[PDB]
Write an enzyme that holds these catalytic residues in place. Structure first.
Site, PDB file in Angstrom:
ATOM      1  N   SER D 349      -1.770 -45.891 -52.774  1.00  0.00           N
ATOM      2  CA  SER D 349      -0.456 -46.206 -53.064  1.00  0.00           C
ATOM      3  C   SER D 349       0.104 -46.215 -51.610  1.00  0.00           C
ATOM      4  O   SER D 349      -0.031 -45.319 -50.593  1.00  0.00           O
ATOM      5  N   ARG D 350       0.414 -47.380 -51.491  1.00  0.00           N
ATOM      6  CA  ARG D 350       1.010 -47.915 -50.062  1.00  0.00           C
ATOM      7  C   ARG D 350       2.164 -47.164 -49.761  1.00  0.00           C
ATOM      8  O   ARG D 350       2.267 -46.575 -48.646  1.00  0.00           O
ATOM      9  N   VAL D 351       3.255 -47.082 -50.842  1.00  0.00           N
ATOM     10  CA  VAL D 351       4.132 -46.083 -50.928  1.00  0.00           C
ATOM     11  C   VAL D 351       3.922 -44.498 -50.332  1.00  0.00           C
ATOM     12  O   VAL D 351       4.209 -44.441 -49.355  1.00  0.00           O
TER      13      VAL D 351
END
Lengths: 509, 467, 167, 487, 156, 106
Positions: D349-351
């Site tokens: 999850s780059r987030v």
């Protein structure tokens, strides 16, 4: 009507009496325009493939004489265009201005020497539609041709009148390859014979003004431009224009050829043309085909490229040398047009990136690079050193079979690798390169007679610089002689050698 | 004149203008379309019926519906009131802060400038990222494309650049968000305010945002790019500015072109393409340049579609480039961030001539080193070593160190990395490699280079990694 | 190309495209009426050998086909100058196709101020006024007839399914 | 009634060339005599190319197509919570009707950035693996990519199951409207699925939009858009909605097919490229809204199915470029055993950290990394060829930790449990245990702390962010307990 | 590829080359992959002719298997019985090479002729490989194998 | 014209005679062209008959009267083909003149 024009401007009068008709023979009203594809109503009578002129101030080519309309390719803009527009015959197919004042110039293919310096009018004009020569018109290329790129001149030693494919992916100095040749031709352009004075035609097909701007700049820096036409239909330049650019160029190089002069056209590149053309076709709903390309792009090219030839004396003996270019995508020559081209050119020139990253500039697969021709355009100079060398490289590579893990099937052979490598050092040519024969063979000679293998590969390059300039300095006597003979003279081999050895001794130590 | 919807065949609204036939490109206004509805004339289909593209919300529409031609293209505010502002295609605050008033308005079509006005020459511009400059040394006012796939820290990387550069960079920058994720803009936005580069105490921020999110009609997405360009043209020429043109993502522009092509009655070319790709490109990229007014130094995110570059679009693109950053899925996959495909993160403007040979050579030595290394891989892949010499091993290792050295942490995305990232002033780079090459590093742990910028730090990092 | 008027009908059934020729042509000069009526003559004047395979028959050879209209329509003054499209459509093979044009047209000055039921109840009374479905419901409410099956009879149909439709 | 009837000009192949209906709204859903819907998508001057919604043979030329005069909205509301609907938002459950007699346009758009506010949210799925490595916020688009019962679904259920507790909580913010959009999902599958939810009765806050396998292509096509509207409702009502699109792979197929059938052509993978526009447009509406919308969300967990594991695949590449990370589930591990079966490496999850929860974060910071290191040694090590004691631990530890992200089907965790079981390992307390004994430990350890140290656990949740006290408490609790678990 | 695919249907003799063979420099550059004439068979041709050919085709194939290792690997990884085949095959290769006078400019080697009886015979000896008193690549581009035998010696 | 059991060659230079008529043609029928030749009215279009020219041509031309043979193709069949080389119509090509195939059979 049917499909086409049940326009009730059209239908609407046919009623009355089929009244309402501009000319429809030599003028038409633009039936529809969209997509720069002007179905131009009327014009009907018209020649085939007459270039017409639009009421947009553009030119077009009434390419397709459709029984109802004329599919007219728009040589320019088209917000500009709207329908009903009068497209008037000019009565005339393309000719392009031809002349010599294009040497020194960057042009648009219309023969307006634009560059953002705008043009200088090449007073003469010439049909671009002019065909390729016959046998009697032709003659053999015995004549060599140069690039001042050792490798080229040596191992794929050229001639003038050609059709040789230059092939590789971008800016390896992809263009550099062409440039160094061009730079080299300067001396030839200063060179007395007017086949040494070789009119360079760089057809830039779809090559962006900026790239070109740099390129030309490069040329500027080289001011080789003085003997050079750059036929320029940049990336922006409309597709027919880009398309046209070679044909135009083509008539123009033949002009010199047939005016005895030797012109060299670099088609860089038909890759972009095909796309354009195809596209052009396609917009006309005329086909794609293999590789989305319609197949008479071969006819196009086949006809186009034969127009580079080496002519007999009847043509002033001249030539139009074509070194056509295709810049590959991942060496994709499987690629239709490349397949074609493979059947067309009398050899083809391979670049290996691999080598390039390895630093090998040039990076060429000489092994693949071929002039099917080869010997017929040669010089003995080169012939004397290069044959064996080719062979020796053959061996280097051959011994690259096991130059892998291990590289000694014996010292000799290990040596052959050493040599190969030594010779390799010679085959890289930095950016900007424009040798003479004597220099090249000289340098080759040493190595091919194996004096460099004692010497270590890095210092070959260093040497190469030193050596060449050294001999150049002193033994212009000798060099003069070799140069003169166009071929390696034995006396000179020894004198040279002696120089070499000693000089070598001075370079190494 | 007035047109009638004769067909809405998709958002291609074929409008039959009966006694009007304003030139192609003319923005037509749909009457009753509250959704400020520009139809852009595309074709005179004949019958004064035009192919237009609807570029706004459309539904409700009935055939016949009345359109009032604006008789010319779109006028959109061009010039400085856009900095700060997030504008849409039609030049309209989607920063949503009341209107945007840059009093110079525009048709968003322009030409290729002259060759003489073109860059006939440019210069390596340092970025201070080792790999970046080194392999792709960058030219001021040119077009640099960044090929790279999907969300690959692509964004991260650009951001990082932006961070380093657009910040540093005093000039204006233009961001033209083609198909850009609304979200991504959101974050960015919030950042932008935050960063205070955008601060709204300056609508003459160093950045104009033009966002044209992927939710948009493709035609709209397609054109937002031009919009950004037109403004930037404002900035180059008018504002004399060194513009940074951040493009995310030129692919989508093109994508929109190709996408539409079919529907246009055009043929969707190879791979479906726009056959007008080239011209699109030609016109677009050629609109960009360094004039001698300003420079539009163009940072173009280029999605590598489906990871095919051979793919005509990317295939085309290269011509229009001056520097390519091809990011390697493998490098990326090695987690290495920089995630580059360094063996096609390039600049033609790599050359000793230009960049000094040291750089160049070192790079070539590297390019080579990797290359050779590259060569081996196929064997080794199943077949390990010792069927190779240890100098090959050395290069391999070195290449590997180097590999790690290209891994250079990300200061921005501590969220992703945890690392603080480095800027490497050039020498540490040139030197850096010269040293590794020198074998000066060739007894250190390779992770030393991993996620470092300056080589010393790699040494520092080495020491501790050496426990 | 020619700035013109293509009034109701329109619709461009191709023969609507044709109609539109005269929807500007007859219409202008208002040899609308002349022609409108002309057609009426023609249709059935036509359709026998002077239409059929003693005409339409491609095996008549096209020029000859002209010269059997231009011997068939310059056979008739029912196209004293709107013949020409005939002699064109002739060539353009649209001969069997004329009804649609004719209709479209004729309709294009009749269906160029009419109306027709299209309704969820019976009619085919038709009308020649634009304002309508008020007047007519006084002719409906008047006369009782039609196929009854003719328009919706909202009985077998709607309604008829409905208990079934609940179950 | 004139043009409020039209006659099917010609019909075949669900493309109803439609006579009349020109006065039509653009994008009008229209109504057939067969009661079937269509949409007059293409208004050609001649006819209306009506994408006929549904599957037929049930029509014939001249059939009356009556305008419905309406542009699509889909029934919307919270009354689809506690409902399984077909794509049109009609029952299939046959539990009588919904309550979602409000309808809301499928034609509605993505927020302005001003209308949107970036994610900083928590939102956990109860899944250790997930919440740890891809801890979730809200509004986010995150690709779940995973395959044909890899328990591909199982996981989602557990996620949902986890949300139950919030929906049983009063924390709306931790509550989620779960929308399970089922594309192509055969009825049996669905039957089970639904059934499961019923059992879990998380169904109460849950829509299942179900377009099973048979379903007409437009329906399935529409379905996401339907879904697309519906969650946005919740979202504007500050609510945090979850849409699971499982899966657009089928949609695209359908769509292309549809396009092709429209003769409308394509490119890549035989798909037309505005299948992207389709998704983009679909996906942009996933958002974490600004505050104006009650700060709502529609968190999108799109799902994508890898044919042959392939992702380089245009449509997968696409979706990735949209999504804010991807969760790779890697099935081999499943054969290999592993529940769940994941390529963690790809799972990102780059987030990531923006989507977090501090409690977890305290162990998770360390954990992501230790697993990172473990992974680093998955990579460095974990061949048939790599060890030293340092790494041997990471491996050992790692392997242990793996078990902790291992996770049965039909079963998520509360976060505090997650932190807990993890905690032991973080500070290295169960490396002492073999990988094999971890789960046993975990189970036991968990029921123990639940029993006693609910004190602690409750608390750890309470401060929502561990503290030394908790740590210390845990530490004895665990160590000793561990000692108890074992001995 | 349909075009040649079809073409084959009409053939009666074919020369099937191998650009690889060409690439190996060999002129002739052939490759019996279907360099045949269906009228090949021991009755039709000499049976010897036939037989010699089959033996040859065989050896070359086996030799061919090992051949890439060599392509990426020198004069080395072998068991000698097999070296025998290598050498012979290499010879076979070499004897098949014929110089080119018509191409003398290109070759630097003048074309030759070996009518059939010698040819077959030639190979029968090679098969008998006596040319072991002799090396092998000194057996390139001759007419008579004899000249090759000669040609080797003078080198020595 | 008789477009029933005859047709006129609608277009030709396709080697497929698109033929108008022959309308009471069966499906799969052997027809015969005016150019000698056989063809088969293979394809029954409303409008024309795609007629495969059962052989080759350059003789044929438009409008040529194509006559039904009204027969679905049969080939001689028999038992006397033993020792016999035939053309595909089941009639010789042996150059030994005819076969003994009395019968023909579809």
């Amino acid at each position: 009507k049917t499909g086409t024009a049940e326009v009730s401007s059209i239908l609407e009068e046919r009623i009355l009496g089929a009244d309402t008709s501009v000319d429809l023979e030599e003028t038409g009203r633009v039936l529809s325009i969209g997509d720069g594809i002007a179905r131009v109503h009327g014009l009907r009578n018209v020649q085939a493939e007459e270039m017409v002129e639009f009421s947009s101030g553009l030119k077009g080519m009434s390419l397709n004489l459709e029984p109802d309309n004329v599919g007219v390719v728009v040589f320019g803009n088209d917000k500009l265009i709207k329908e009903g527009d009068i497209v008037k015959r000019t009565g005339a197919i393309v000719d392009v201005p031809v002349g010599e004042e294009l040497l020194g110039r960057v042009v648009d293919a219309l023969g307006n020497a634009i560059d953002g310096k705008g043009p200088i009018g090449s007073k003469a004009r010439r049909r671009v539609g002019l065909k390729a020569p016959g046998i009697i018109p032709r003659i053999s290329v015995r004549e060599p041709m140069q690039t001042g790129i050792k490798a080229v001149d040596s191992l794929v030693p050229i001639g003038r009148g050609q059709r040789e494919l230059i092939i590789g992916d971008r800016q390896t100095g992809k263009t550099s390859i062409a440039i160094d040749t061009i730079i080299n031709q300067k001396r030839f352009n200063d060179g007395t014979d007017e086949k040494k004075k070789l009119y360079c035609i760089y057809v830039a097909i779809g090559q962006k003004r900026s790239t070109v701007a740099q390129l030309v700049k490069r040329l500027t820096d080289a001011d080789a431009m003085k003997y050079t036409i750059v036929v320029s239909a940049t990336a922006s330049d409309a597709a027919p224009l880009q398309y046209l650019a070679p044909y135009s160029g083509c008539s123009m190089g033949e002009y010199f050829r047939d005016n005895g002069k030797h012109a060299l056209i670099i088609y860089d590149d038909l890759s972009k043309q095909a796309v354009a053309y195809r596209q052009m076709s396609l917009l006309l709903r005329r086909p794609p085909g293999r590789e989305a390309y319609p197949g008479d792009v071969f006819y196009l090219h086949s006809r186009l490229l034969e127009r580079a030839a080496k002519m007999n004396d009847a043509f002033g003996g001249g030539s139009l040398t074509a070194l056509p270019v295709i810049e590959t995508q991942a060496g994709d020559v499987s690629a239709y047009i490349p397949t074609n081209v493979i059947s067309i050119t009398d050899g083809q020139i391979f670049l290996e990136t691999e080598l390039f990253y390895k630093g090998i500039r040039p990076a060429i697969n000489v092994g693949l690079s071929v002039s099917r021709v080869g010997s017929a355009a040669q010089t003995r100079a080169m012939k004397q050193v290069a044959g064996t060398m080719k062979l020796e490289l053959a061996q280097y590579r051959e011994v690259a079979a096991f130059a892998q893990f291990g590289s000694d099937l014996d010292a000799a052979t290990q040596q052959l690798l050493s040599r190969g490598v030594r010779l390799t050092e010679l085959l890289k040519q930095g950016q900007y390169s424009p040798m003479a024969i004597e220099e090249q063979v000289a340098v080759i000679y040493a190595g091919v007679r194996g004096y460099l293998d004692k010497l270590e590969p890095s210092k070959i390059t260093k040497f190469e610089n030193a050596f060449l300039s050294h001999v150049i300095s002193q033994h212009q006597a000798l060099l003069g002689k070799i140069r003169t003979d166009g071929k390696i003279s034995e006396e000179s081999d020894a004198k040279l050698k002696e120089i070499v050895t000693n000089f070598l001794a001075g370079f190494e130590a | 004149t007035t047109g009638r919807i004769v067909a809405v065949i998709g958002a291609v609204v074929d409008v039959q203008f009966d006694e009007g036939l304003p030139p192609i490109l003319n923005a037509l206004e749909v009457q009753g379309r509250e959704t400020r509805l520009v139809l852009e004339v595309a074709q005179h289909l004949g019958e004064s019926t035009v192919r237009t593209i609807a570029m706004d919300g459309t539904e409700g529409l009935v055939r016949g519906q009345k359109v009032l031609d604006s008789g010319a293209p779109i006028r959109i505010p061009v010039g400085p009131e856009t900095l700060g502002r997030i504008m849409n295609v039609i030049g309209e605050p989607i920063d949503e802060r009341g209107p945007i008033k840059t009093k110079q308005f525009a048709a968003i079509h322009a030409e290729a400038p002259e060759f003489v006005e073109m860059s006939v020459e440019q210069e390596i511009l340092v970025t201070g990222i080792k790999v970046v400059d080194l392999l792709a040394p960058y030219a001021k006012g040119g077009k640099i494309g960044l090929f790279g796939g999907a969300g690959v820290g692509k964004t991260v990387l650009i951001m990082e650049l932006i961070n380093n550069v657009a910040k540093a960079h005093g000039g204006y920058s233009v961001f033209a968000g083609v198909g850009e994720r609304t979200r991504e803009g959101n974050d960015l936005y919030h950042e932008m305010i935050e960063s205070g580069v955008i601060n709204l105490k300056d609508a003459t921020s160093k950045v104009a945002l033009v966002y044209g999110q992927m939710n948009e009609p493709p035609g709209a997405r397609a054109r937002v790019a031009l919009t950004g360009l037109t403004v930037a043209e404002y900035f180059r020429d008018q504002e004399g500015q060194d513009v940074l043109l951040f493009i995310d993502n030129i692919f989508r522009f093109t994508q929109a072109g190709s996408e539409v092509s079919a529907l246009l009655g055009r043929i969707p070319s190879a791979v479906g393409y726009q056959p007008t790709l080239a011209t699109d490109m030609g016109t677009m990229q050629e609109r960009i340049t360094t004039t001698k007014k300003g420079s539009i130094t163009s940072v173009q995110a280029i999605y590598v579609p489906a990871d095919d570059l051979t793919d005509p679009a990317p295939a085309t693109t290269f011509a229009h480039l001056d520097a390519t950053t091809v990011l390697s899925r493998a490098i990326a996959e090695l987690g290495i961030y920089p995630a580059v495909d360094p063996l096609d993160s390039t600049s033609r403007i790599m050359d000793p001539n230009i960049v000094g040979s040291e750089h160049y050579d070192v790079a070539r030595g590297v390019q080579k080193i990797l290359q050779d290394y590259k060569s081996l891989q196929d064997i080794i892949a199943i077949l390990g070593m010792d069927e190779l010499s240890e100098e090959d091993k050395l290069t391999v290792s070195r290449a590997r160190k180097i590999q790690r050295f290209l891994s250079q942490p990300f200061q921005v995305a501590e969220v992703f990395t945890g690392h603080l990232g480095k800027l490497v002033p050039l020498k540490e780079t040139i030197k850096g490699f010269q040293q590794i090459l020198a074998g000066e590093y060739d007894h250190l742990p390779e992770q030393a280079f991993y996620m470092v910028g300056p080589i010393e730090e790699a040494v520092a990092k080495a020491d501790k990694l050496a426990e | 190309f020619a700035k013109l008027v293509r009034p109701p009908v329109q619709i461009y059934g191709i023969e609507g495209r044709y109609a539109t020729a005269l929807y500007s042509a007859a219409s202008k000069q208002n040899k609308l009426e002349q022609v409108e009526k002309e057609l009426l003559r023609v249709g059935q004047i036509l359709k026998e050998p002077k239409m059929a395979a003693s005409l339409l028959n491609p095996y008549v050879k096209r020029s000859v086909k002209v010269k059997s209209l231009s011997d068939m329509t310059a056979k008739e003054k029912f196209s004293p100058l709107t013949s020409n499209l005939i002699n064109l459509l002739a060539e353009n093979g649209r001969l069997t196709n004329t009804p649609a044009v004719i209709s479209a047209f004729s309709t294009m000055m009749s269906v160029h101020r009419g109306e027709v039921p299209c309704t969820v109840t019976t009619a085919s009374a038709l009308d020649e006024t634009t304002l309508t479905e008020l007047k007519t419901v006084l002719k409906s409410f008047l006369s009782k007839g039609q196929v009854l099956k003719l328009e919706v009879k909202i009985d077998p149909s709607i309604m008829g399914g409905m208990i079934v439709r609940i179950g």
